[PDB]
Amino acid sequence: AGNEGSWFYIQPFYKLRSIGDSVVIGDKVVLNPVNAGQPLHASSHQLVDNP
Amino acid sequence: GCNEVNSVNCNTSWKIVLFMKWSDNKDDILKGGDVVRLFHAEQEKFLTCDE
């Protein structure tokens, strides 16, 4: 759909490495909805069809 | 001992060696001959030693 919410969260954080530059490989803060939309789950929440 | 050098009759050897270049001197770089404050640390902190 490529619709409203995706769209990403403006995408850095931590400390190393402020916004306004190139990140190649590392680890990152990924998407938000425009509707707010971050933060995000890590979860311990699933059902029976899978472990 | 804390002598010095000027004016009066006396021959003397001098000079130095590999220190700074037209390359390194400008700018920021790692100013190796004149490095400044110790810190790695980005944990909102810039640690450095004290007694």
Tab-separated table of N, CA, C and O in Angstrom:
chain	number	residue	atom	x	y	z
A	1	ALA	N	0.828	-1.194	0.000
A	1	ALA	CA	0.000	0.000	0.000
A	1	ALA	C	0.864	1.245	0.000
A	1	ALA	O	0.518	2.241	-0.629
A	2	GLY	N	1.999	1.176	0.682
A	2	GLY	CA	2.941	2.277	0.695
A	2	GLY	C	2.296	3.508	1.286
A	2	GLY	O	2.661	4.639	0.975
A	3	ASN	N	1.317	3.276	2.144
A	3	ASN	CA	0.472	4.341	2.634
A	3	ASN	C	1.028	5.067	3.839
A	3	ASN	O	2.179	4.877	4.224
A	4	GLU	N	0.156	5.853	4.460
A	4	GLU	CA	0.533	6.960	5.333
A	4	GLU	C	1.603	6.633	6.353
A	4	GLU	O	2.522	7.417	6.568
A	5	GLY	N	1.487	5.473	6.980
A	5	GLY	CA	2.322	5.178	8.123
A	5	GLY	C	3.708	4.704	7.751
A	5	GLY	O	4.590	4.618	8.602
A	6	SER	N	3.918	4.413	6.476
A	6	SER	CA	5.206	3.892	6.058
A	6	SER	C	5.707	4.549	4.791
A	6	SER	O	5.345	4.083	3.715
A	7	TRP	N	6.522	5.611	4.853
A	7	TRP	CA	6.927	6.426	6.024
A	7	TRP	C	7.680	5.815	7.214
A	7	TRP	O	7.209	4.920	7.896
A	8	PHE	N	8.848	6.381	7.482
A	8	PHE	CA	9.620	6.028	8.660
A	8	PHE	C	9.765	7.094	9.710
A	8	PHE	O	9.618	8.282	9.462
A	9	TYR	N	10.089	6.626	10.902
A	9	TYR	CA	10.623	7.479	11.929
A	9	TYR	C	11.916	8.048	11.401
A	9	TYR	O	12.667	7.360	10.709
A	10	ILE	N	12.145	9.318	11.697
A	10	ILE	CA	13.393	9.960	11.353
A	10	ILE	C	14.443	9.131	12.066
A	10	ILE	O	14.314	8.909	13.259
A	11	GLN	N	15.512	8.716	11.398
A	11	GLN	CA	16.076	7.433	11.808
A	11	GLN	C	17.558	7.383	12.192
A	11	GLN	O	18.395	6.951	11.413
A	12	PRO	N	17.883	7.897	13.383
A	12	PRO	CA	19.020	7.490	14.200
A	12	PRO	C	18.668	7.546	15.687
A	12	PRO	O	17.508	7.801	16.009
A	13	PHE	N	19.643	7.299	16.563
A	13	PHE	CA	19.567	7.704	17.974
A	13	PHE	C	20.871	7.335	18.681
A	13	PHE	O	21.956	7.746	18.269
A	14	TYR	N	20.742	6.551	19.742
A	14	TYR	CA	21.833	6.155	20.608
A	14	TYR	C	22.600	7.354	21.111
A	14	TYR	O	22.150	8.038	22.028
A	15	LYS	N	23.743	7.622	20.498
A	15	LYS	CA	24.653	8.615	21.038
A	15	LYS	C	25.828	8.870	20.112
A	15	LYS	O	26.328	9.992	20.013
A	16	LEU	N	26.237	7.818	19.414
A	16	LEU	CA	27.464	7.813	18.636
A	16	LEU	C	27.461	8.877	17.578
A	16	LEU	O	28.498	9.411	17.200
A	17	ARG	N	26.262	9.194	17.123
A	17	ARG	CA	26.090	9.371	15.707
A	17	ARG	C	24.827	10.144	15.377
A	17	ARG	O	23.780	9.566	15.100
A	18	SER	N	24.940	11.462	15.408
A	18	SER	CA	23.789	12.341	15.315
A	18	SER	C	23.190	12.379	13.914
A	18	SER	O	23.851	12.043	12.939
A	19	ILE	N	21.924	12.776	13.837
A	19	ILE	CA	21.238	12.978	12.568
A	19	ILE	C	21.960	13.987	11.678
A	19	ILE	O	22.486	14.989	12.158
A	20	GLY	N	21.989	13.712	10.380
A	20	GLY	CA	22.650	14.587	9.432
A	20	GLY	C	23.960	13.982	8.980
A	20	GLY	O	25.009	14.612	9.090
A	21	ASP	N	23.887	12.754	8.476
A	21	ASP	CA	25.064	11.999	8.060
A	21	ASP	C	24.675	10.644	7.490
A	21	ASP	O	23.510	10.300	7.479
A	22	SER	N	25.657	9.890	7.013
A	22	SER	CA	25.419	8.566	6.446
A	22	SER	C	25.590	7.477	7.488
A	22	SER	O	26.620	7.441	8.151
A	23	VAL	N	24.618	6.573	7.639
A	23	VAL	CA	24.862	5.392	8.467
A	23	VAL	C	24.867	4.381	7.303
A	23	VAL	O	23.998	4.414	6.437
A	24	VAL	N	25.852	3.483	7.309
A	24	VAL	CA	25.827	2.293	6.474
A	24	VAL	C	25.335	1.144	7.356
A	24	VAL	O	24.156	1.075	7.674
A	25	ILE	N	26.231	0.265	7.785
A	25	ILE	CA	25.837	-0.803	8.695
A	25	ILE	C	26.050	-0.474	10.159
A	25	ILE	O	27.107	0.009	10.555
A	26	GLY	N	25.017	-0.743	10.950
A	26	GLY	CA	25.058	-0.604	12.391
A	26	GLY	C	23.811	-1.249	12.960
A	26	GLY	O	23.551	-2.428	12.731
A	27	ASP	N	23.042	-0.471	13.710
A	27	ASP	CA	21.741	-0.897	14.207
A	27	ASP	C	20.911	0.347	14.474
A	27	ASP	O	21.439	1.350	14.931
A	28	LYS	N	19.617	0.305	14.180
A	28	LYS	CA	18.885	1.561	14.063
A	28	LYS	C	17.441	1.549	14.507
A	28	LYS	O	16.848	0.507	14.738
A	29	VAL	N	16.893	2.751	14.604
A	29	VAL	CA	15.637	3.022	15.284
A	29	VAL	C	14.370	2.778	14.478
A	29	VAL	O	13.268	2.888	15.007
A	30	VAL	N	14.548	2.484	13.196
A	30	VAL	CA	13.483	2.132	12.246
A	30	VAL	C	12.187	2.961	12.300
A	30	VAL	O	12.139	4.037	12.882
A	31	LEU	N	11.144	2.413	11.680
A	31	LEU	CA	9.901	3.108	11.327
A	31	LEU	C	9.067	3.661	12.472
A	31	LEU	O	9.033	3.083	13.547
A	32	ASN	N	8.376	4.768	12.200
A	32	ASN	CA	7.207	5.187	12.968
A	32	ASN	C	6.051	5.347	12.006
A	32	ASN	O	6.272	5.463	10.811
A	33	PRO	N	4.816	5.250	12.502
A	33	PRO	CA	3.688	5.884	11.809
A	33	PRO	C	3.789	7.405	11.785
A	33	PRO	O	4.351	7.991	12.705
A	34	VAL	N	3.267	8.033	10.736
A	34	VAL	CA	3.043	9.471	10.761
A	34	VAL	C	2.003	9.783	11.805
A	34	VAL	O	1.953	10.887	12.341
A	35	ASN	N	1.165	8.790	12.083
A	35	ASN	CA	0.051	8.968	12.987
A	35	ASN	C	0.592	9.204	14.400
A	35	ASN	O	-0.102	9.767	15.245
A	36	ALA	N	1.824	8.756	14.656
A	36	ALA	CA	2.628	9.322	15.745
A	36	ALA	C	4.147	9.169	15.515
A	36	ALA	O	4.828	10.190	15.454
A	37	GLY	N	4.712	7.963	15.378
A	37	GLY	CA	4.058	6.674	15.517
A	37	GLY	C	4.884	5.723	16.364
A	37	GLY	O	4.388	4.717	16.864
A	38	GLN	N	6.160	6.043	16.522
A	38	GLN	CA	7.018	5.304	17.434
A	38	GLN	C	6.715	5.667	18.884
A	38	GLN	O	6.042	6.664	19.139
A	39	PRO	N	7.190	4.858	19.848
A	39	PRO	CA	8.189	3.781	19.769
A	39	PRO	C	7.694	2.458	19.198
A	39	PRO	O	6.992	2.442	18.190
A	40	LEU	N	8.089	1.353	19.816
A	40	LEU	CA	7.801	0.049	19.234
A	40	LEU	C	7.911	-1.133	20.191
A	40	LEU	O	8.613	-1.077	21.195
A	41	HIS	N	7.218	-2.209	19.844
A	41	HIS	CA	7.213	-3.432	20.632
A	41	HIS	C	8.532	-4.167	20.557
A	41	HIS	O	9.322	-3.947	19.659
A	42	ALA	N	8.793	-4.986	21.561
A	42	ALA	CA	9.792	-6.030	21.448
A	42	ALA	C	9.058	-7.336	21.703
A	42	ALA	O	9.329	-8.358	21.077
A	43	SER	N	8.125	-7.261	22.648
A	43	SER	CA	7.083	-8.261	22.865
A	43	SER	C	7.528	-9.615	23.400
A	43	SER	O	8.650	-10.068	23.185
A	44	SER	N	6.604	-10.245	24.110
A	44	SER	CA	6.709	-11.629	24.524
A	44	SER	C	5.335	-12.221	24.295
A	44	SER	O	4.744	-12.833	25.180
A	45	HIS	N	4.836	-12.024	23.082
A	45	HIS	CA	3.418	-12.166	22.798
A	45	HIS	C	3.170	-12.821	21.441
A	45	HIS	O	3.429	-12.226	20.398
A	46	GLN	N	2.672	-14.054	21.468
A	46	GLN	CA	2.464	-14.843	20.256
A	46	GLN	C	1.448	-15.937	20.519
A	46	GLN	O	1.052	-16.141	21.663
A	47	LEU	N	1.031	-16.657	19.480
A	47	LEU	CA	0.083	-17.743	19.708
A	47	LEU	C	0.524	-19.101	19.175
A	47	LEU	O	1.614	-19.266	18.630
A	48	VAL	N	-0.388	-20.053	19.325
A	48	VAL	CA	-0.106	-21.481	19.312
A	48	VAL	C	0.453	-22.052	18.006
A	48	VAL	O	1.214	-23.020	18.033
A	49	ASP	N	0.113	-21.448	16.873
A	49	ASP	CA	0.495	-22.015	15.580
A	49	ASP	C	2.009	-22.096	15.456
A	49	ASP	O	2.551	-22.942	14.749
A	50	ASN	N	2.676	-21.201	16.172
A	50	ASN	CA	4.121	-21.120	16.176
A	50	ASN	C	4.626	-21.061	17.600
A	50	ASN	O	3.864	-20.760	18.512
A	51	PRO	N	5.901	-21.409	17.804
A	51	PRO	CA	6.543	-21.179	19.101
A	51	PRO	C	6.630	-19.689	19.428
A	51	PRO	O	5.637	-18.976	19.309
B	1	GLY	N	68.211	21.988	37.363
B	1	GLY	CA	68.938	22.561	36.246
B	1	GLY	C	67.944	23.293	35.373
B	1	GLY	O	66.883	22.760	35.062
B	2	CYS	N	68.273	24.514	34.978
B	2	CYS	CA	67.300	25.333	34.276
B	2	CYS	C	67.985	26.496	33.568
B	2	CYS	O	67.637	27.655	33.765
B	3	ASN	N	68.967	26.169	32.741
B	3	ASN	CA	69.792	27.171	32.078
B	3	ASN	C	69.058	27.846	30.930
B	3	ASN	O	67.838	27.715	30.818
B	4	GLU	N	69.793	28.566	30.080
B	4	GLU	CA	69.243	28.983	28.791
B	4	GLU	C	70.348	29.434	27.819
B	4	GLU	O	71.527	29.156	28.022
B	5	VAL	N	69.950	30.127	26.760
B	5	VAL	CA	70.782	30.327	25.588
B	5	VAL	C	70.538	31.671	24.919
B	5	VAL	O	69.426	31.935	24.473
B	6	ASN	N	71.566	32.516	24.857
B	6	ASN	CA	71.526	33.738	24.049
B	6	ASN	C	72.841	34.491	23.967
B	6	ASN	O	73.741	34.279	24.771
B	7	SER	N	72.958	35.328	22.944
B	7	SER	CA	73.913	36.423	22.953
B	7	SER	C	75.393	36.045	22.910
B	7	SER	O	76.083	36.298	21.925
B	8	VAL	N	75.869	35.453	23.996
B	8	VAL	CA	77.297	35.344	24.281
B	8	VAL	C	78.011	34.295	23.425
B	8	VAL	O	77.391	33.355	22.955
B	9	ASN	N	79.317	34.463	23.231
B	9	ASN	CA	80.109	33.530	22.433
B	9	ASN	C	80.014	32.079	22.910
B	9	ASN	O	80.474	31.754	24.004
B	10	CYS	N	79.444	31.216	22.069
B	10	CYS	CA	79.417	29.768	22.297
B	10	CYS	C	78.766	29.029	21.138
B	10	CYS	O	77.635	29.324	20.759
B	11	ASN	N	79.484	28.065	20.579
B	11	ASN	CA	78.940	27.225	19.523
B	11	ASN	C	77.940	26.233	20.082
B	11	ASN	O	78.066	25.821	21.236
B	12	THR	N	76.942	25.846	19.285
B	12	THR	CA	75.956	24.881	19.766
B	12	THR	C	75.168	24.153	18.664
B	12	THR	O	74.738	24.760	17.689
B	13	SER	N	74.980	22.846	18.848
B	13	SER	CA	74.089	22.033	18.021
B	13	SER	C	72.630	22.239	18.411
B	13	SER	O	72.351	22.618	19.538
B	14	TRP	N	71.699	21.989	17.496
B	14	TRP	CA	70.283	22.221	17.791
B	14	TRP	C	69.302	21.348	17.008
B	14	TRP	O	69.556	20.180	16.736
B	15	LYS	N	68.164	21.952	16.684
B	15	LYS	CA	67.128	21.372	15.830
B	15	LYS	C	66.490	20.079	16.275
B	15	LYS	O	66.861	19.491	17.285
B	16	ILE	N	65.505	19.659	15.488
B	16	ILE	CA	64.520	18.684	15.924
B	16	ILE	C	64.296	17.743	14.751
B	16	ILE	O	65.188	17.567	13.923
B	17	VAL	N	63.098	17.168	14.664
B	17	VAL	CA	62.741	16.246	13.596
B	17	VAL	C	61.256	16.282	13.219
B	17	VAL	O	60.620	17.337	13.175
B	18	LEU	N	60.731	15.095	12.950
B	18	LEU	CA	59.416	14.897	12.373
B	18	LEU	C	58.325	15.406	13.295
B	18	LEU	O	57.891	14.697	14.202
B	19	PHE	N	57.888	16.639	13.069
B	19	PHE	CA	56.808	17.205	13.863
B	19	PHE	C	55.933	18.156	13.066
B	19	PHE	O	56.343	19.267	12.735
B	20	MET	N	54.724	17.690	12.774
B	20	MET	CA	53.707	18.441	12.040
B	20	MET	C	54.098	18.658	10.578
B	20	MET	O	55.275	18.681	10.230
B	21	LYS	N	53.088	18.805	9.729
B	21	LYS	CA	53.287	18.947	8.297
B	21	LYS	C	52.365	19.975	7.716
B	21	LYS	O	51.516	20.532	8.399
B	22	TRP	N	52.555	20.253	6.442
B	22	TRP	CA	51.615	21.105	5.757
B	22	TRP	C	50.328	20.344	5.579
B	22	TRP	O	49.252	20.926	5.469
B	23	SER	N	50.450	19.025	5.569
B	23	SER	CA	49.297	18.168	5.398
B	23	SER	C	48.412	18.189	6.635
B	23	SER	O	47.275	18.654	6.595
B	24	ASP	N	48.950	17.690	7.738
B	24	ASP	CA	48.177	17.498	8.954
B	24	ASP	C	47.665	18.778	9.599
B	24	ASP	O	46.583	18.799	10.179
B	25	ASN	N	48.436	19.849	9.477
B	25	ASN	CA	48.232	20.999	10.337
B	25	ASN	C	46.863	21.624	10.184
B	25	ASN	O	46.329	22.202	11.125
B	26	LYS	N	46.290	21.501	8.999
B	26	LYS	CA	44.947	22.002	8.770
B	26	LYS	C	44.009	20.893	8.318
B	26	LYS	O	44.209	20.323	7.247
B	27	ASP	N	42.997	20.567	9.119
B	27	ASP	CA	42.821	21.059	10.481
B	27	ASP	C	42.094	19.942	11.205
B	27	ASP	O	41.926	18.864	10.646
B	28	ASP	N	41.656	20.190	12.433
B	28	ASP	CA	41.030	19.156	13.239
B	28	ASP	C	41.941	17.949	13.300
B	28	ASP	O	42.645	17.761	14.287
B	29	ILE	N	41.908	17.147	12.234
B	29	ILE	CA	42.629	15.877	12.133
B	29	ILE	C	42.625	15.134	13.457
B	29	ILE	O	41.694	15.250	14.250
B	30	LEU	N	43.655	14.334	13.671
B	30	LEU	CA	44.083	14.027	15.011
B	30	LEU	C	45.348	14.819	15.250
B	30	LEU	O	46.412	14.476	14.741
B	31	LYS	N	45.226	15.897	16.008
B	31	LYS	CA	46.356	16.766	16.284
B	31	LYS	C	47.314	16.057	17.220
B	31	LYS	O	47.360	16.350	18.408
B	32	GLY	N	48.097	15.139	16.672
B	32	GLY	CA	48.842	14.211	17.497
B	32	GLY	C	49.858	14.860	18.402
B	32	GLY	O	50.050	14.425	19.534
B	33	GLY	N	50.499	15.915	17.924
B	33	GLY	CA	51.489	16.590	18.733
B	33	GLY	C	50.823	17.456	19.777
B	33	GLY	O	51.450	17.851	20.753
B	34	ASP	N	49.543	17.740	19.574
B	34	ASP	CA	48.794	18.570	20.503
B	34	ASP	C	47.365	18.087	20.652
B	34	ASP	O	46.410	18.815	20.415
B	35	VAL	N	47.248	16.834	21.059
B	35	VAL	CA	45.973	16.189	21.306
B	35	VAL	C	45.274	16.872	22.475
B	35	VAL	O	45.929	17.487	23.307
B	36	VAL	N	43.949	16.826	22.515
B	36	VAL	CA	43.244	17.352	23.669
B	36	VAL	C	42.325	16.258	24.250
B	36	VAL	O	42.601	15.081	24.059
B	37	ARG	N	41.231	16.627	24.917
B	37	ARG	CA	40.770	15.904	26.105
B	37	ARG	C	40.481	14.412	25.980
B	37	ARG	O	39.808	13.963	25.062
B	38	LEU	N	40.964	13.660	26.968
B	38	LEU	CA	40.665	12.237	27.068
B	38	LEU	C	39.191	11.949	27.252
B	38	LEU	O	38.607	12.310	28.274
B	39	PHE	N	38.606	11.281	26.262
B	39	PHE	CA	37.359	10.566	26.460
B	39	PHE	C	37.038	9.693	25.264
B	39	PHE	O	37.226	10.084	24.116
B	40	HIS	N	36.577	8.489	25.562
B	40	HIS	CA	35.926	7.634	24.592
B	40	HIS	C	34.454	7.927	24.749
B	40	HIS	O	33.944	8.904	24.204
B	41	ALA	N	33.791	7.032	25.474
B	41	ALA	CA	32.616	7.329	26.283
B	41	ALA	C	31.557	8.210	25.647
B	41	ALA	O	31.753	9.402	25.457
B	42	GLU	N	30.416	7.617	25.342
B	42	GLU	CA	29.296	8.390	24.859
B	42	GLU	C	28.063	8.147	25.701
B	42	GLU	O	26.969	8.585	25.357
B	43	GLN	N	28.248	7.491	26.838
B	43	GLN	CA	27.130	7.164	27.713
B	43	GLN	C	26.618	8.435	28.379
B	43	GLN	O	26.426	8.486	29.588
B	44	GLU	N	26.393	9.462	27.563
B	44	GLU	CA	26.123	10.818	28.030
B	44	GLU	C	27.329	11.326	28.826
B	44	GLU	O	27.298	12.396	29.428
B	45	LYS	N	28.418	10.570	28.782
B	45	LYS	CA	29.558	10.845	29.634
B	45	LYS	C	30.830	10.884	28.816
B	45	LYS	O	30.939	10.195	27.813
B	46	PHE	N	31.788	11.689	29.262
B	46	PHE	CA	33.120	11.745	28.680
B	46	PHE	C	34.189	11.492	29.735
B	46	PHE	O	34.876	12.423	30.147
B	47	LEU	N	34.338	10.241	30.168
B	47	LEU	CA	35.232	9.950	31.287
B	47	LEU	C	36.679	10.306	31.036
B	47	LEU	O	37.194	10.214	29.926
B	48	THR	N	37.313	10.716	32.122
B	48	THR	CA	38.723	11.014	32.154
B	48	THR	C	39.166	10.965	33.609
B	48	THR	O	38.374	11.210	34.511
B	49	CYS	N	40.434	10.654	33.838
B	49	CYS	CA	40.901	10.337	35.184
B	49	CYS	C	40.974	11.506	36.153
B	49	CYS	O	40.980	12.670	35.757
B	50	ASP	N	40.957	11.161	37.435
B	50	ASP	CA	41.274	12.090	38.506
B	50	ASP	C	41.764	11.295	39.710
B	50	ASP	O	41.477	10.104	39.838
B	51	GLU	N	42.523	11.950	40.579
B	51	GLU	CA	42.909	11.358	41.847
B	51	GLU	C	41.687	11.261	42.742
B	51	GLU	O	40.845	12.155	42.726
